[PDB]
Write a protein that holds these residues in place. Sequence first.
Motif, PDB file in Angstrom:
ATOM      1  N   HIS A  30      14.117  43.624  13.122  1.00  0.00           N
ATOM      2  CA  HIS A  30      14.137  42.820  14.329  1.00  0.00           C
ATOM      3  C   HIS A  30      14.089  41.334  14.054  1.00  0.00           C
TER       4      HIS A  30
ATOM      5  N   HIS B 171      15.825  37.534  16.182  1.00  0.00           N
ATOM      6  CA  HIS B 171      16.604  37.105  17.339  1.00  0.00           C
ATOM      7  C   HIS B 171      17.978  36.653  16.864  1.00  0.00           C
TER       8      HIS B 171
ATOM      9  N   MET C 296      11.946  35.836  14.964  1.00  0.00           N
ATOM     10  CA  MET C 296      11.010  36.794  14.420  1.00  0.00           C
ATOM     11  C   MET C 296      11.650  37.317  13.161  1.00  0.00           C
TER      12      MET C 296
END
Length: 312
Positions: free
Chosen positions: A198, A200, A270
Amino acid sequence: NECLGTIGPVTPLDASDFALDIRMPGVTPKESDTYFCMSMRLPVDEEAFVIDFKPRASMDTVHHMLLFGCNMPSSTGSYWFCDEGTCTDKANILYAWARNAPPTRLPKGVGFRVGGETGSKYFVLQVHYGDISAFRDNHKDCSGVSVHLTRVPQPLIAGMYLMMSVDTVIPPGEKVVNADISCQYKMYPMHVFAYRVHTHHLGKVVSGYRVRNGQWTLIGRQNPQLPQAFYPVEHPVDVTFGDILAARCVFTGEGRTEATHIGGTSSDEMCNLYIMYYMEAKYALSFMTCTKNVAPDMFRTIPAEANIPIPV
Ligand SMILES: [Cu+2]
Ligand SMILES: [Cu+2]
Ligand code: NI
């Protein structure tokens, strides 16, 4: 025709198993790319084991779904808006469903421990809607997940090793910024069977490795711009006492006018790697986190693939 109505969320399966349906309470997203959260207390107070998940998603409108365990959901009441803000205590990821990246089942004999004295008391479901087509009629959506729970203790216990950056700063226009994460592993052996990455919009590639005697074994590497599902590990990988876990996210600052740091919004970044593992029941712990970089120098010998993007 998916809202449960009069039958409610709990289906008995046999003497010690039940399905718990965790569903949006007939919501209607007004804007596109919306993030809804809701929670449910576990119906049983004693310890239980989550041994399967079945998606109940509207294939038109649902882009992704995540299910967590925690003890304090961010909000009370029916549902809330959650731009990835699900719990006030630590949210334990259990399941991801992404469109165009169908999920893989838990290996048989593996379950997450929940409830009881130390396990999660709540599930929190996050639903990302994206495209607001078919919502023309303003219909009520009851998308979510059906969870199979059992009181039967499982021989193998699923857990999560989360590696996450905290201090990353991506200067604007900077071509490459690396975020490095590393910790020594000091528990009983875990076997990694799935991973999820994960970042962005600035994330290019995310890779995680087990390092043993300077030798780098790949756990997973993915383009974080591809659907953020849990992908099966190519070969099962044990991590044992003395091993070092290592992860690198590669970011760019290209496109930004100001610096980008770690945080909870879309103009933040992140670097998260979710390493899903099983452990023998008698050795098992349910979650571990690395937010540090204890062996920064070790990264000099990181495989070249960790710096090269995946050809889309
Ligand atoms: Cu999504
Ligand atoms: Cu995020
Ligand atoms: Ni093994």
